[PDB]
Design a protein around this ligand. Structure first.
Ligand SMILES: C[C@H]1O[C@H](O)[C@H](O)C[C@H]1O
Ligand SMILES: [Ca+2]
Length: 214
């Protein structure tokens, strides 16, 4: 791509008012299919992660997390390199949306979100918590490198990704684990699941999750 829209706000501004899959032209001149939410909170949100049904396996390698994986019509991880490139310029606010098995929605908002490069293991650079009924469960993870089952960078004597079955900016191990193993009900819940500590707490998973930037 020579050029095209740099982000979902630009798309909205030019009259793309329906949420859905669009192409962004990234700073290096590469076109990237992304999901834009044009409707929630004024719209213009780049949805980079979504859990909905357990249809997609989230227990994936460093390379899969780097490049992205999943299905456009359901669950996906956009990819760490994409997120690093997107967030190299500009301030992007993070909105996390969580929905439990009862359909109760709760949200968390952080002022900025940025990923460092692969050399720094896509370390998370997270702004301060602004508001959210779900509470703050990502602050712990700021300043921490990403780890996967084949790339242990956490602060644990073991590999947190293996132990807890996911991929995240693990410490030893987490306050949030949104890329963790899917569970279709509280009865099928895993020891460590799609957890938000300040929300429903560790071991008490959610039914739907999105992470998104604007
Ligand atoms: C071993 C450890 O794993 C994570 O950090 C959980 O949040 C709490 C705990 O059980
Ligand atoms: Ca370790």
């Amino acid at each position: 791509c020579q050029e095209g829209p740099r982000n979902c706000r630009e798309l909205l501004s030019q009259g793309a008012t329906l949420s859905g899959w669009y192409h962004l032209c990234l700073p290096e001149g590469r076109a990237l299919p992304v999901f834009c939410d044009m409707d929630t909170e004024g719209g213009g949100w780049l949805v980079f992660q979504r859990r909905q049904d357990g249809s997609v396996d989230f227990f994936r390698s460093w390379s899969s997390y780097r490049a992205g994986f999943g299905n456009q019509e359901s669950e996906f991880w956009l990819g760490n390199e994409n997120l690093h490139q997107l967030t190299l310029q500009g301030n992007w606010e993070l909105r996390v949306e969580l929905e439990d098995f009862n359909g109760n929605r709760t949200f968390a908002h952080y002022a900025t979100f940025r990923l460092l490069g692969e050399v720094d293991h896509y370390q998370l650079a997270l702004g301060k918590f602004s508001e959210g009924t779900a509470g703050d469960s990502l602050s712990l993870h700021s300043g921490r490198p990403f780890t996967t089952y084949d790339a242990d960078h956490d602060s644990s004597n073991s590999n947190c990704a293996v132990i807890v079955h996911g991929a995240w900016w693990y410490a030893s191990c987490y306050r949030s684990n949104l890329n963790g193993r899917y569970a279709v009900s509280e009865a099928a819940a895993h020891k460590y699941g799609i957890d938000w500590a300040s929300g429903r707490g560790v071991g008490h998973p959610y039914r739907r999750v999105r992470m998104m930037l604007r």
